[PDB]
Design a protein around this ligand. Structure first.
Ligand SMILES: [Mg+2]
Ligand SMILES: [Mg+2]
Ligand SMILES: [Mg+2]
Lengths: 165, 170, 258, 153, 129
RNA sequence: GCGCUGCUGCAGUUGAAACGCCCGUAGUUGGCCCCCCGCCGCCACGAGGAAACGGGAGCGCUCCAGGCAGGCCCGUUGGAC
């Protein structure tokens, strides 16, 4: 129940000539441009991912003022086992904190595959992570690395920086 | 109706149990007065059971059972008092008894290291439990029941036959 | 194994809090059975010879007692080894000295001088309720006293007020959170404080958490917690309000006294 | 070659960092899913199945596509064998050694190899008996090995 | 077989420093190694390091700047009473002025000075100076 | 003394000392990973339970080995821990 969903859904209906989204979150960057995330339901992520690049481009052209990102919504449980007193319940490994963050990272920029991750530990600076991307693509995603870092920090408290190799 | 069905199974047992002529004497539960079984109506309770306490629960088998055991803690005339411990089953060849293995650790100061030790402890197993080797049992202290027995089982978790033996302090 | 009970008591084996000199001799007084036990009592002779100093030897105590010069709970006693315990009444009319036996902070016996207004009663702890002959209810106390037909409202661990002349209950203070208590066992003997919490472990002891008047907190088991009133002591107590000082303060006080 | 020998080489395979499929992939997991059945229906071991898929169908890794391994698929389809393949091949080698030995009984290297193979078989069988992948009653015996080979194959 | 990753890492680091190199590689990337290196970095012995992911026991790279003389582990983790630390200090380190002994406690990985301040003890991991 | 019994903390090519080799059960030892749930060990605090001895606060038996005394206007004199 927000204004943005209404016009983005209007655009959605204006694309084809079935699939619905859960919610939307926008976050600003250092520049006046913001980035909007779409919390897609988990099962329909792959169906949205067949040609997500086209959808994001058409949405950007339809409604400017901020970039459109599409991601799934995953839950996190905070206990490996559960002691009901009678039987012990195992938490599946897919619901851990670490798996969700990595999947989020891969989803933020699915069309361009990540070729490596590295975390650096400076002497005093808060430890930070730098990823590695192909040189085949750069100017395609060079202009939108700051937004990627900002959204990663927003969703995950962990920070990051982007490079190419 | 449930009560009527239960009494027949209880009432019926005391019959052929009497026809089991091999037994030297008629085994009976002391609390009950023999004669109630002649009452055609379910006007009196045919079986006796108590609550152990300490947060434990009386198994349904004892309540819906048909056996006689003076040394059982639920249907007998013995009480649980003192220390409650845990262990694993080592042997179960005896009639109504088992051997429980207990694991602990001993510290040697000179070498600043530990040793693994074990002890054998005998317990009385009521007919209300089914136990095999390697299961985990909880035993409660009671008065001397024999030369080497001062404990009775009150709980038992199950285990699988295939399971590499693991040193398990409890 | 001794074939019978024990009638002696080596001085080196005596309780620490009696404060008996190592070189006094091989032997020490052996208390006789009575209101209080061996480790929760003190003989009369020790009070009358090693403290008040009204006697110099065993013989003088013998003469003083057999002349009936001391009253205990309103009753003259003539046994030098009679055991004196907690919350008892000590009277010597010849010199008009009235004392109630309580505990100091350091964990030793003391005499609290009192008045005539409150020497007609004593406080006792109830720790056993049972059915006697014919089924008639009874109760018992820390001083080996039995009362028939108590009020149903009275339960165990409570505290009872009884007149010295007549063993008739006047009032009873319940055992509840928010009540002043006096510790009477172990490391914290003599400390005064108010209850804060009660935690019970099935089949074992029950632990009590109290806070001193100055905010100090301490623990002990329920077997040595005594109630002395509702938020305020019913009886007169020593000069200090049950405050155990630290080693530094005690050393300072000793230096001042020297 | 370490557990029962002295050598120590390091010939292995290094799978890629990225789990995604190829950009020329044109198969949904269903196509691979039924293909496995057809090869399974012909009595093909999983390893040969993987080699066939990789060579003819140009699928380097099945897990990257269907999200699951081959044996898991077979079990879900109720076609997985009762004896794991490695133990079965171990038993085959033991049987072949035993037959060659019954033919002539002056060769000692063969006895040495047989001892080693039986030791390995016993270890692996114990491990599989644990984890409840085999019945507890399962037991390997020299004299009726071929029967358990053929009947369970 | 490989057992104590920390020992191999420390031995490699010391060997590299002995010939005055600047960068090293260490196959294991355990958390305990990470905390050990963090303490070293904060105290000023090794400066910077990075962890290189690969899905198969990530690798780690560290930089050297001299200074460090020795660093080792204690293979069986003893139990150190809060009040029984001076004996180990005297037995292991060259002087009471400098040096750091690593203990793992219920409060996390810390140095013997910090634990002495909090009057608590635990298990010993290693040392360096 | 003795690091000549070596847990801290010995030696094992030539001084005394690596089984001829392999398999293998008890036994000992076991890579990495899940941020909070239960259990074992572990650390800290606490209760409870004898003194003497030992440590230790104070007191000039002429000092001391000792003892728990002693002064006047003594913490309720003290004998704490
Ligand atoms: Mg081997
Ligand atoms: Mg190798
Ligand atoms: Mg030689």
């Amino acid at each position: 129940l927000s204004e943005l969903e209404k016009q983005v859904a209007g655009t959605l209906l204006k694309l084809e000539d079935t699939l619905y989204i859960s919610s939307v979150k926008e976050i600003a960057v250092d520049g006046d441009k913001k980035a909007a995330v779409v919390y897609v339901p988990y099962p329909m992520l792959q169906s949205f991912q067949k040609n997500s690049e086209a959808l994001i481009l058409k949405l950007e052209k339809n409604h400017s003022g901020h970039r459109f990102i599409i991601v799934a919504n995953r839950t996190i449980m905070k206990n490996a086992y559960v002691f009901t007193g009678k039987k012990s319940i195992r938490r599946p490994r897919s619901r851990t904190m670490t798996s969700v963050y990595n999947c989020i990272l891969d989803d933020i920029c699915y069309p361009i595959h990540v070729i490596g991750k590295r975390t650096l530990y400076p002497a005093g600076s808060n430890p930070r992570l730098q990823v590695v991307l192909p040189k085949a693509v750069y100017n395609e995603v060079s202009e939108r690395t700051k937004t990627y870092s900002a959204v990663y920090k927003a969703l995950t408290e962990r920070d990051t920086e982007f490079i190419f190799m | 109706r449930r009560a009527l069905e239960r009494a027949e199974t209880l009432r019926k047992a005391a019959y052929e149990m009497a026809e089991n002529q091999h037994e030297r004497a008629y085994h009976k539960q002391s609390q009950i007065f023999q004669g109630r079984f002649l009452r055609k109506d379910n006007a009196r309770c045919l079986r006796f059971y108590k609550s152990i306490g300490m947060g434990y629960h009386t198994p349904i088998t004892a309540i819906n059972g048909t056996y006689i055991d003076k040394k059982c803690p639920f249907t007998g005339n013995v009480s649980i008092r003192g220390r409650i411990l845990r262990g694993v089953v080592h042997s179960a060849k005896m009639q109504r008894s088992i051997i429980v293995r207990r694991d602990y650790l001993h510290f040697v100061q000179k070498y600043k290291r530990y040793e693994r030790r074990h002890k054998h402890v005998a317990a009385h197993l009521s007919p209300c439990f089914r136990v095999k080797e390697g299961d985990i049992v909880t035993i409660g202290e009671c008065r001397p029941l024999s030369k080497t027995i001062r404990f009775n089982v009150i709980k038992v978790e199950p285990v699988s036959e295939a399971a590499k033996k693991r040193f398990s302090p409890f | 194994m001794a074939r019978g009970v024990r009638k002696h008591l080596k001085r080196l084996n005596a309780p620490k809090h009696w404060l008996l000199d190592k070189m006094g001799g091989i032997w020490a007084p052996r208390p006789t059975n009575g209101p209080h036990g061996l480790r929760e009592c003190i003989p009369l002779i020790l009070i009358l010879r090693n403290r008040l100093h009204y006697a110099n030897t065993y013989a003088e105590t013998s003469m003083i007692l057999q002349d009936k010069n001391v009253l205990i709970d309103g009753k003259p006693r003539t046994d030098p080894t009679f055991p004196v315990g907690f919350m008892d009444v000590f009277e010597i009319p010849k010199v008009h000295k009235t004392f109630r036996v309580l505990y100091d902070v350091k964990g030793r016996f003391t005499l609290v001088p009192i008045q005539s207004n409150e020497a007609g009663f004593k406080l006792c702890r109830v720790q056993k309720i049972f059915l006697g002959d014919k089924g008639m209810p009874y109760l018992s106390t820390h001083d080996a006293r039995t009362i028939r037909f108590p009020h149903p409202d009275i339960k165990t661990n409570d505290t009872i007020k009884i007149n010295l002349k007549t063993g008739k209950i006047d009032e009873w203070y319940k055992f509840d959170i928010g009540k002043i208590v006096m510790v009477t066992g172990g490391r914290n003997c003599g400390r005064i404080g108010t209850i804060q919490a009660i935690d019970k472990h099935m089949g074992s002891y029950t632990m009590i958490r109290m806070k001193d008047t100055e905010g100090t907190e301490f623990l002990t088991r329920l077997c040595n917690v005594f109630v002395i009133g509702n938020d305020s002591p019913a009886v007169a107590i020593p000069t200090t309000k049950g405050i155990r000082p630290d080693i530094i303060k005690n050393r300072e006080l000793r230096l001042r006294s020297i | 070659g370490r557990m029962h020998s002295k050598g120590k080489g390091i010939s292995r395979s290094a799978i890629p960092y990225t789990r995604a499929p190829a950009p020329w992939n044109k198969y949904t997991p269903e196509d691979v899913c039924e293909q496995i059945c057809k090869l399974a229906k012909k009595g093909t071991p999983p390893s040969r199945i993987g080699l066939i898929l990789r060579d003819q169908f140009a699928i380097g890794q099945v897990k990257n596509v269907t999200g699951s391994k081959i044996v898991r698929i077979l079990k879900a389809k109720g076609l997985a064998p009762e004896i794991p393949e490695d133990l079965y091949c171990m038993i085959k080698k033991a049987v072949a050694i035993r037959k060659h030995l019954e033919r002539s009984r002056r060769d000692k290297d063969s006895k040495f190899r047989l001892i080693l193979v039986e030791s390995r078989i016993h270890r692996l069988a114990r491990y599989y008996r644990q984890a409840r992948r085999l019945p507890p009653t399962f037991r390997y015996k020299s004299d009726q090995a071929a029967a358990l080979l053929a009947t369970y194959a | 077989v490989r057992i104590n990753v920390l020992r191999d890492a420390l031995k490699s680091i010391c060997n590299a420093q002995r010939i005055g190199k600047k960068q090293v590689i260490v196959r294991p990337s355990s958390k305990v190694i990470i905390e050990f290196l963090q303490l070293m970095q904060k105290n000023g012995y090794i400066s910077d390091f990075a962890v290189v992911d690969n899905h198969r026991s990530n690798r780690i790279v560290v930089n050297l700047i001299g200074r460090l003389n020795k660093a080792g582990v204690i293979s069986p983790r003893f139990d150190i009473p809060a009040n029984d630390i001076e004996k180990w200090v005297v037995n292991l380190l060259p002087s009471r002025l400098f040096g750091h002994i690593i203990l793992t406690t219920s409060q996390g990985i810390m140095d013997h000075i910090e634990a002495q301040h909090r009057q608590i003890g635990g298990k010993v991991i290693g040392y360096f100076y």
